[PDB]
Design a protein around this nucleic acid. Structure first.
Lengths: 201, 198, 201, 198, 198, 201
DNA sequence: GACCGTGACCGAGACTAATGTCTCGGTCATTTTTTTGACCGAA
DNA sequence: TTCGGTCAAAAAAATGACCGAGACATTAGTCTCGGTCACGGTC
DNA sequence: GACCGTGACCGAGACTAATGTCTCGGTCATTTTTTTGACCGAA
DNA sequence: TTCGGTCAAAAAAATGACCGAGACATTAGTCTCGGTCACGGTC
């Protein structure tokens, strides 16, 4: 058979790049979803033939956020042994931070609104499921003892606070510019991931 | 007149203190705010002199209690507790910052009193330097990393700025807040400050 | 709480609380109006537009003392335990022996001389009410069987006698300094005044 | 001879006693004294010095009967009898109590005749001595709770002061003038101050 | 539509490349190529009907790669390394070159679409003239032998064709079908040509 | 010397040389044996003496090839100088392309049929011995240092490609019309052939 | 006691008349494959 | 005044398929191969 | 050799006529002390 | 929506201040204190 498997795959890859080049600061509350259709490599048209104003594999682009997560989970690296997972998770999370800003536009218009319920309620469902899957690793970590033997939502909520703090940090009017020209913050990210909710004799 | 006014002013202090810890919502002007202690319209003016300048004086008296809790008079054993008690102050009664978020996004008319706001910003930087100076003391301890410690400032600042949204914006803490083992873990962080490596 | 609540209540309350310890120093002809006003932190026009002359002040003070003794009488409920009630009575009456001896002096000074007939009559009638209240307490004491079974005015007079003699004990030149601040013998007197009338089978 | 002078002195003393009980102490100079006695003016001064000597000799004879009272003769000396007799002698005749209370600050503490004053203080101390001796005699077999003796002293002090001042009240003495059952009540509960379970 | 067109064209080219490399040219036709294509025989027909549309397309693309190879970007271009890349571009995948010569001597005789062949010889002359100017450039500095350029043109074509015949001779093909050492040996000999004997 | 021996020798020689030219003209398949006989013009009974048939053609042509290689092996000079023999061999291999073409035709119809591929194995053994002598005098000159330290078969295949390139170029219907009257092109080819594979100081 | 080189005759790989079968898909037709722009609602 | 999420479709995109030309491969009369008995010369 | 108890006389702490000086601020007046509700603009 | 930041003021709030009553404290004639020479009785 022909690379029609590969052709739909590379549609999703060109769209991994297309939605990206839009959404480096665009979202949906910042760009009209049908005009996001207009805004891309293919016309608005094939974004309603292949898609429905980004939809048919933008639901999947958000699931591909959730999959760069759910495939980190089953990390293709043979190790997938310990904290290297949640570390790379945080690293993934804290990039093109308009990241939580884009999901904040989604929070404005579609998420708890469920304007695409086909996107966001399924997202809520199975991101809670996959949340409990990373939390299942972190149950393997509570088995490791490297992390505390307290509930796992303890450690999760600490991580959510820490990550949202990273995001909102790079939004502070002038209490971020001291940092914004500093990438010793990235060794600090290494130290965050290695040694938060962690062990210390 | 002398201790008359002192009792008056500490009454003012504790009044706004409790009232901004827990008393405020979508609020008509200080005919609701300072009428929380049943006063009137110009009773606000014997008192506070503001139909709606308490829609910043909430923040200003808050910032004054801030100014006070920036005590550099800790006895011994430098804790970073300028930082940690500031974080405590903010997050303890997390509904304190819920009410800050609320009343702010109710009343916030972009840029209130420039004069007060910028003197605030001034001394905020100054007490940021006092905070950073307790960090300088633990740099005298060699206990915190010798960096430009606006690093440390910002890091724990955001550690709590996210505690606010994890407690406010419905996500997962509000699902498992019923069990305040998580606030007990905030407390554990409160007590497990900078433990040496055994 | 509002405006003139504040002005009225603050002025009069601290006026009273100044004149109290002023009299505990010296007395009531020794201490006088201008002393009291100047000792507050304010002046005598607060006074002279609240109370002009000393008799009004004394009557205010004494019916305030009587309202304090009323709150003392108000033993709420629960069988109205009278042991600790008599205890509090003797303490409230004996503490600051300068205070009770001052009111005894003021009886002969302003009351027996009867400066202000109106508030004097008010005190007479409410004293009838308070004598009735203490009589009621004594009646329920005798009903309980603690006290000796006799009329109640017996024990009314006996309690007044013990209180007066005990404040005199903290006013004599002989054993005042031995007992004016000895909490041990103060409580001893309170026990003797609370363990009175008891049955002896 | 000796008995004639003795009875003359006793007549002068009781005459002046009734006078000072009736009239007073300051305006009652020797005028009323020798007007009532009348045996002879110089013949009255054959026996006494003035009003002041008569005051202090009355107090002397009072304390003489008191010293006659204090005694510990019985083998089975159950001290309830001496205790009740002391309570009676203290509380009986409240007019005598008011009298000597006036005479004290009139002539004693002024001490126009100080030898009798120091003898009064002497016999005060001696009555105190026998009282404490009696208290420890009671405590000997365990017949009281363990408290100081001066506790009981000042307790009886307040008791008798209350009694005399109550029967000298402005109004309630009008009610108690005919109440000897109240006196029996006073005696019973004055015998029953501060006791422990057997 | 458009990018769909790119898809079909590129797939058809690579498919026919593989098939022809294995089986020569009379064997391979529209249908082996359509099957390996998978997206059709009309995919072949409606784009490429005959068998030599493919050959002309292929060899003109090959010579366009040869022209991009002969870069005029570097004015002081390393002509020796460019000649190395030329020899490698033409010699690599030798069975590709034997396929090229097979189709060459086929359609030089048949010439299904002669106008494409007129264009081909014209554009070949154009590339050869650029090559010729570059031979003049590398003769001027004194690396090649000072003779007419087309001498070196025919010499390079002969050397590549002979190396291909070597990479299909039944004796030394297996000795040198993948001798990268001998491949670079051939390249350096063809590139160090015309150098004056020191 | 041998009157009759030389007679028969030159008879075979001239007959099969006439044949060589006949098949440079027409070919070896269409032309049969007594065609060669009537071409030469001797008693064809004498023609059939030679070997048997077209086998005569193939056989003695490979024999002439063998005798050329026999002359090519070794010459006479002090140290048996290398450049002269090398250049002469380069020339002769790059000489007379149609001769080599018809020899390829003979090779093809020798191994296609099964008359005598033994002469083909003889060609390969004389090839091997000539290559061995090539390596031998190459190393004789490298005694003082002549060619770089690469294999000898490297230079073998280099000269192979060179000779085939020359022959195929002068066979190419496009450029042969230009270079057919260019012996300067042959001189250039020889300069290329002698200046390859040599070491550099 | 031996042998070179050509005048007298006739039968078969191929050539030249007479025949026969391929090459893949070309020109067709079929289903079909990413590929606009409107076409409606939320905040 | 900020955007939020939906259907029919070309031009040819993906499966075949009668009927196409001019060219190998034999095979009879011969081409032109493929042969000799018999007749001339020398130690 | 000694001494108890009362008829004959006259001079002074206080009482009773005659006078004289306090108590603090009371009823006044002064300045005065936290104490509404409108009265305007921002975003 | 959705709030943001300003002046005159009572009722008496804070300083005095003539003119207030009925009560200690002496002091002359005496109250009534304060005294005796001189005259009666016993070992």
């Amino acid at each position: 058979e022909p690379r029609k498997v590969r052709e739909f795959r590379r549609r999703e890859q060109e769209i991994l790049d297309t939605a990206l080049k839009l959404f480096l600061e665009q979202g949906e509350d910042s760009v009209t979803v049908e005009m996001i259709a207009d805004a891309v490599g293919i016309g608005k048209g094939t974004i309603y033939k292949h898609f429905k104003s980004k939809a048919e594999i933008y639901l999947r682009l958000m699931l591909d956020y959730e999959r760069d997560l759910a495939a980190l989970f089953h990390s293709e690296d043979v190790a997938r042994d310990k904290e290297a997972l949640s570390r790379a998770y945080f690293e993934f999370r804290m990039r093109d931070p308009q990241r939580y800003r884009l999901f904040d536009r989604l929070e404005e218009k579609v998420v708890k609104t469920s304007q695409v319920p086909e996107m966001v309620e399924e997202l809520h469902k199975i991101r809670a499921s996959n949340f409990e899957r990373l939390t299942q690793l972190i149950k393997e970590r509570i088995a490791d003892g490297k992390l505390e033997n307290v509930p796992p939502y303890f450690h999760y909520c600490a991580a959510w606070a820490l990550v949202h703090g990273a995001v909102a940090l790079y939004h502070s009017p002038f209490w971020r510019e001291v940092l914004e020209d500093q990438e010793g913050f990235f060794h600090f990210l290494m130290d965050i991931g290695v040694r938060m909710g962690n062990k210390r004799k």
